[PDB]
């Protein structure tokens, strides 16, 4: 009997760090939905005189504690899941505390989440390229690093990281555009196709422990 891996490795925010980011995320959706910049472009958001509530729009949310996923392993069935688990840094970091840096919150017609900017030490726990996806092409590793805050009814969990990457691909091209508004936390940007990003004036710091989830 070999030992199977967790469902996925990642940094799991503490109760207070979760609550803090969880509230700020909720606030952001309430601010965006009220913002006039967003109300003009509801057409790009949903196909169907009145107003949308984004907290309700993102019904599928994390029940309790939040987290930043590193490697999806699926108990080893996923490719590269085993090679990642043998890494001394993964073994050495298992159960240790880390401080993740949130640089921005984002919203799409599919997902709501937060951008994570990992340190080098934390990037060593980031899985590398055996198959390298199309979405993260040209972007440095860990660009996908995120914390899922909300998903639309028919959106899959993988979509959050892809939505973050997609938004970051536009910023690289310089299609970020000028800020269309100013929220108390930072500048609001409209990237088109229902994509919205809040660039935090102050990098929010969260406290988490690197471990594995089993379902």
Author numbering: 161 to 208, 212 to 378
What did the published study say regarding this structure?
In addition to the catalytic His mutants, near-complete catalytic inactivation is evident also in T232A, T311A, F235A, F235L, and Y168A. The inactivation by the T232A and T311A mutations was expected: threonine or serine is found in the catalytic motif in all 2H phosphoesterases, and in CNPcat, they are involved in all stages of catalysis, in achieving the correct substrate binding mode together with His230, His309, and the active-site water network.
2′,3′-cyclic nucleotide 3′-phosphodiesterase (CNPase) comprises 4% of total myelin protein in the central nervous system (CNS), being the most abundant CNS non-compact myelin protein4. CNPase consists of an N-terminal polynucleotide kinase-like domain10, a catalytic phosphodiesterase domain11, and a membrane-anchored C-terminal tail, which contains a cysteine residue that undergoes isoprenylation. The catalytic domain enables the rapid hydrolysis of nucleoside 2′,3′-cyclic phosphates to nucleoside 2′-phosphates.
